Short mmCIF file of the C-alpha atoms (twelve columns), coordinates in Angstrom:
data_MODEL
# 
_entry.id   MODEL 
# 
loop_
_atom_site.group_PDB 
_atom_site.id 
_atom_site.type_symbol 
_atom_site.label_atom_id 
_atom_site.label_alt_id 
_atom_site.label_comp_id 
_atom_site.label_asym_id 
_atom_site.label_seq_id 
_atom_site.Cartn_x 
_atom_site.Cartn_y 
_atom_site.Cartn_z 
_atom_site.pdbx_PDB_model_num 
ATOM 1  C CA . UNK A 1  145.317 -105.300 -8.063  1 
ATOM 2  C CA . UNK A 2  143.258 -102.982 -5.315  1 
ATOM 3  C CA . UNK A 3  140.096 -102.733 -6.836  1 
ATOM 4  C CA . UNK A 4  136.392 -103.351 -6.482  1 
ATOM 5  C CA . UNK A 5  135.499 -105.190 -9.430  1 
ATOM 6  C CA . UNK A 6  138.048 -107.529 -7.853  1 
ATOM 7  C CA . UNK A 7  135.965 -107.818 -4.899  1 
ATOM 8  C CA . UNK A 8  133.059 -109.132 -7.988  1 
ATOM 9  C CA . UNK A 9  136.089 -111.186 -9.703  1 
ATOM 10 C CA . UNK A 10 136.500 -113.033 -6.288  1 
ATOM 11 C CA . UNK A 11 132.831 -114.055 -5.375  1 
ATOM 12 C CA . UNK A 12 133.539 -116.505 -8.293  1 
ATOM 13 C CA . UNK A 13 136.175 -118.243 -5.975  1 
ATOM 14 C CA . UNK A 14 133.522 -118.034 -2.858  1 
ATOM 15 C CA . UNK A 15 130.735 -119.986 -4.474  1 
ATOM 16 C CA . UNK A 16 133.178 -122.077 -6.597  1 
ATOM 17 C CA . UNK A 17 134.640 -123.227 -3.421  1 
ATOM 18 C CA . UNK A 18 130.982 -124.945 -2.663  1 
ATOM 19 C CA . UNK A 19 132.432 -125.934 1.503   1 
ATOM 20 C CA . UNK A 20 132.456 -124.325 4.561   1 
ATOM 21 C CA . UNK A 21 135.528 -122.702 6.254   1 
ATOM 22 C CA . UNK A 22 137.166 -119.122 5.832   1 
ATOM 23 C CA . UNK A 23 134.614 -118.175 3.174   1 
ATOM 24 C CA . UNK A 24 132.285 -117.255 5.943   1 
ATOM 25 C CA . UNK A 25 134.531 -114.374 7.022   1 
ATOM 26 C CA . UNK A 26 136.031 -114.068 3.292   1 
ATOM 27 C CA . UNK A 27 132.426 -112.318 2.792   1 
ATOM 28 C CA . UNK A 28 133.202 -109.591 5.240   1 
ATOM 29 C CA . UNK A 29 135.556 -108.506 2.610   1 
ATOM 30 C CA . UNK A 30 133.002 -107.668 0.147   1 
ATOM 31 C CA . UNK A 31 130.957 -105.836 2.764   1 
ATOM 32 C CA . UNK A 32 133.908 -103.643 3.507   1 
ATOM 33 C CA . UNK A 33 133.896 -102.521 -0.409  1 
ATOM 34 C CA . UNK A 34 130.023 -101.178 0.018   1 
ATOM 35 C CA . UNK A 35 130.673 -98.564  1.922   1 
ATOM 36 C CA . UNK A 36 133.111 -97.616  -1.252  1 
ATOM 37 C CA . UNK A 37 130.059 -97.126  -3.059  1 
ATOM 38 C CA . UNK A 38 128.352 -95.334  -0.668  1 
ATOM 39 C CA . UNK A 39 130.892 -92.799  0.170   1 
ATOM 40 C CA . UNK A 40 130.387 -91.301  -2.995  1 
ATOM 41 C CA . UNK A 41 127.127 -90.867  -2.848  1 
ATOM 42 C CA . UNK A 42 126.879 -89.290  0.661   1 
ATOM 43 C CA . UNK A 43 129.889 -87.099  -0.470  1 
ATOM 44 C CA . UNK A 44 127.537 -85.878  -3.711  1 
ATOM 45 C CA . UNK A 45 123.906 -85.137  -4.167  1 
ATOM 46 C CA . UNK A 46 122.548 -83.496  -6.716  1 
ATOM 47 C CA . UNK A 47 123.435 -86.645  -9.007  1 
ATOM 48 C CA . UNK A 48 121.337 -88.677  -10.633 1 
ATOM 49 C CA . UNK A 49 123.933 -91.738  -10.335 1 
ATOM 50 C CA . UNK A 50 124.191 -91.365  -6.608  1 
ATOM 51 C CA . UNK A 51 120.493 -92.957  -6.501  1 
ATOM 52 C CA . UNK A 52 121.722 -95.798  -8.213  1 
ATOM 53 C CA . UNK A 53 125.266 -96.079  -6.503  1 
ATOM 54 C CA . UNK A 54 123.009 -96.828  -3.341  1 
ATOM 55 C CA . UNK A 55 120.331 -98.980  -4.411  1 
ATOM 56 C CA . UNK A 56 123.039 -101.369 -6.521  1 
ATOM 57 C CA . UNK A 57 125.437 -100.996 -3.363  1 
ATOM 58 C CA . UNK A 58 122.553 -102.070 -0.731  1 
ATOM 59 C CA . UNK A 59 121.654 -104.863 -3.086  1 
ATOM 60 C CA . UNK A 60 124.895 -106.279 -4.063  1 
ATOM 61 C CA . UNK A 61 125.755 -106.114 -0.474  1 
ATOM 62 C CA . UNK A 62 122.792 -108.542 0.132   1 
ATOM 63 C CA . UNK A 63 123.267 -110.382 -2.944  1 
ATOM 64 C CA . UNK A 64 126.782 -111.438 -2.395  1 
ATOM 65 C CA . UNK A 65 125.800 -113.007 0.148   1 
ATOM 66 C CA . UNK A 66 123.003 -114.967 -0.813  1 
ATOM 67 C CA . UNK A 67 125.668 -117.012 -3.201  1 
ATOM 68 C CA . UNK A 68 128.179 -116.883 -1.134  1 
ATOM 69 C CA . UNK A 69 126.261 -118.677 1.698   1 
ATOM 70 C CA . UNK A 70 125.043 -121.255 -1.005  1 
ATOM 71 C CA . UNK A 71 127.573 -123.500 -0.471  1 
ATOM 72 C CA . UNK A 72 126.290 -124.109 2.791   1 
ATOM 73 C CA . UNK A 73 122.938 -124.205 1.336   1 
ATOM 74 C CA . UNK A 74 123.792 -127.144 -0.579  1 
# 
C-alpha cells in the first residue's frame, strides 16, 4: 500500500513473530516513518496539532519498540 498506518498494521507481525532474527532491523522501518510525522510539524507552526504530531511521534517511536523488543523479552 505505501502508508503509515501500515507501518502500525505491521508491528502486529513484529510482536506476533515472538523470536529473534530480522525483526531487530524490521524496527528501523518504523523509525524511518517518524520523521513523517515530524516533517509536518517543523514545516508548520502556528498549529495546535503540530504539538501533538510530535509528542505522539516521539512516543510511538519509543513505544514500538518496547513491543517489538518483547519477543526477546520473553
Amino acid at each position: 500500500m505505501g502508508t503509515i498506518d501500515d507501518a502500525f498494521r505491521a508491528i502486529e507481525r513484529a510482536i506476533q513473530a515472538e523470536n529473534e532474527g530480522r525483526y531487530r532491523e524490521a524496527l528501523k522501518h518504523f523509525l524511518d516513518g517518524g520523521e513523517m510525522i515530524v516533517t509536518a510539524a517543523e514545516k508548520e507552526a502556528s498549529q495546535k496539532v503540530r504539538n501533538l504530531l510530535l509528542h505522539k511521534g516521539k512516543e510511538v517511536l519509543e513505544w514500538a519498540e518496547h513491543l517489538a523488543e518483547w519477543i526477546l523479552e520473553h
